[PDB]
């Protein structure tokens, strides 16, 4: 009835984007990392910079789409390890190095728009899934515990990319387990529990995708 990939080694430590709107990059690498574990039995930190500086279809620190990232990794025939291409919190010139290649991608799939059931199936059957949400509310930002729900959250304002690393229930409230990229300091050790099956709250199923490996 539930699943938490953190327990399974599919999830890396919580990262911090700093002063850069690279949430999409962190989300993409997170999905990629999960697939790396699943396919190879092990993972490592992949490099968000590689995406920031090389995904021309995206806007660097100005925002991007996870799908464009997955596409780049496939076309490029690889993505670098973090250690290989470290994160500096600003966009720089593309310095991808094949010597550093730590994962590959053979494409991607998008979850059917608005369908939480499909999202649950994807998390169960694939592993961690890249998602986008409205993270603009004061209440989201000061989150610390419980299952987050705020009706004013706007499902049509997907301003922040994150990663669904599981799903479950807590004190009768169904939820998604969500990995953020605002440091371990934010939320519950970098994570937030977000309401599930409550009319696609915060647009959680609006822009969901995963990489094929």
């Amino acid at each position: 009835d539930s699943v938490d990939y953190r327990k399974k080694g599919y999830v890396t430590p919580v990262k911090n984007q700093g002063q850069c709107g690279s949430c999409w990059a962190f989300s993409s690498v997170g999905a990629l990392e999960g697939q790396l574990k699943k396919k190879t039995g092990k993972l490592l930190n992949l490099s968000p910079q590689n995406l920031v500086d090389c995904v021309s279809e995206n806007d660097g620190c100005g925002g991007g789409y996870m799908t464009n990232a997955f596409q780049y990794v496939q076309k490029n025939r690889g993505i670098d390890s973090e250690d290989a291409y470290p994160y500096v919190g600003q966009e720089e010139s593309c310095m991808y190095n094949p010597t550093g290649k730590a994962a590959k991608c053979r494409g991607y799939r998008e979850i059917p728009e608005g369908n939480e059931k499909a999202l649950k199936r994807a998390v169960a059957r694939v592993g961690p899934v890249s998602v986008a949400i409205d993270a603009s509310l004061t209440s989201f930002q000061f989150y610390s515990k419980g299952v987050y729900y705020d009706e004013s959250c706007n499902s049509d304002n997907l301003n922040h990319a994150v990663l669904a690393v599981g799903y479950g229930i807590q004190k009768g409230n169904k939820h998604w387990i969500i990995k953020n990229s605002w440091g371990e300091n934010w939320g519950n050790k970098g994570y937030i529990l977000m309401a599930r099956n409550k009319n696609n709250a915060c647009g959680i199923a609006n822009l969901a995708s995963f990489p094929k490996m």
């Binding site: 949430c23 999409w24 925002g63 304002n157 997907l158 990319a161």
Partner: peptide, 4 residues
């Protein structure tokens, strides 16, 4: 979605 501007996803940052």
């Amino acid at each position: 979605x501007s996803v940052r």
